[PDB]
Amino acid sequence: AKVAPEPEGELPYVHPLPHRSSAYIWCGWWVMDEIQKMTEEGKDWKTDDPDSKYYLHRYTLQKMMKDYPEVDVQESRNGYIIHKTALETGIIYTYP
Amino acid sequence: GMTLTPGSKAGVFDFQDPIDIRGARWAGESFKALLFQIDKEAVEIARQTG
């Protein structure tokens, strides 16, 4: 219910896709693993822990999901494009 | 029993289940996981019949 603190600028670029009101950013395997770990102990990834190792990328993901309702984020372990609804829960494919 | 992966369905082998295909992806990995499953089944047969 809170907003994520802004960690200065230098936000990673998000590519607007007006084709489907979507966007695209390449995060990787570390960001997705971090988000999956955060959404396993009952924590939150959208705004909690504003001093994380890769919180800047998570804040960028939160902004991308707020601005675009059907975001297409691609990881690096499998290169899958998880949508906004699939990224909402914080669990991507597998693993505890 | 011994052939079962801890988290599988205990009787069926579905290619859509991540634990069953050992975290496979696309076609080659999943079908090779099926090959490993039938290998495990043969080994279990060897243990059972002797």
Curated annotation (Swiss-Prot), chain B:
| Top-rank taxon | Viruses
Posttranslational modification? A proteolytic cleavage by the prohead core protein protease gives rise to the mature major capsid protein during virus maturation.
Q: How does it assemble?
A: Homohexamer. Interacts with the portal protein. Interacts with the capsid vertex protein that forms pentamers. Interacts with hoc; one hoc molecule associates with each capsid hexamer. Interacts with soc; this interaction reinforces the capsid structure. A total of 960 subunits of the major capsid protein forms the 160 hexamers.
Function text: Major capsid protein that self-associates to form hexamers, building most of the capsid in association with pentons made of the capsid vertex protein and one dodecamer of the portal protein. The major capsid protein self-associates to form 160 hexamers, building most of the T=13 laevo capsid. Folding of major capsid protein requires the assistance of two chaperones, the host chaperone groL acting with the phage encoded gp23-specific chaperone, gp31. The capsid also contains two nonessential outer capsid proteins, Hoc and Soc, which decorate the capsid surface.
As for family, the record states: Belongs to the Tevenvirinae major capsid protein family.
Q: What is this protein called?
A: Major capsid protein
Q: Which residues of the full protein are shown?
A: 320 to 369 of 521
